[PDB]
Amino acid sequence: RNDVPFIDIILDIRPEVDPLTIDAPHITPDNYLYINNVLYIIDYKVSV
Amino acid sequence: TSIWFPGSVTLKEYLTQIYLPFYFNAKGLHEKHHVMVDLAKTILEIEC
């Protein structure tokens, strides 16, 4: 996934939470990984 | 045509025969007594 909105991450991980939830930040993480009740925000960087 | 002995050589082998003999030399074959004077002579000649 690329530039997935954080609100989409919240909705996918927690479908039960309703809209009008706490306002997700402007951050658009590159990827997210949910395992063992832990959410990892993954961002790719190509720099020296 | 080969250089140091009869036969035919490839261009790579020809360049090898041209350039390898330089490495047959032995370091430290000079004598200080004469090379000191020779180097001084050439330096002072250029300066003059």
């Binding site: - | 200080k32 007594h33 000191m36 004077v37 001084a40 002579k41 330096i43 002072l44 000649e45 300066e47």
Partner: protein, 49 residues
Amino acid sequence: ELILPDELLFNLLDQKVAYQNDIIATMTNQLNSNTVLIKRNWLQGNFNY
């Protein structure tokens, strides 16, 4: 100023026979001064870049 090595003066002062055209002695002022003034020859390898 380029300083001539001590051993070079050692084996140049013990010749016992004057050289035909001694470039070393001319520049050294008849072996009066070990140093020789070098102007245009920046020394080998010093100014590579």
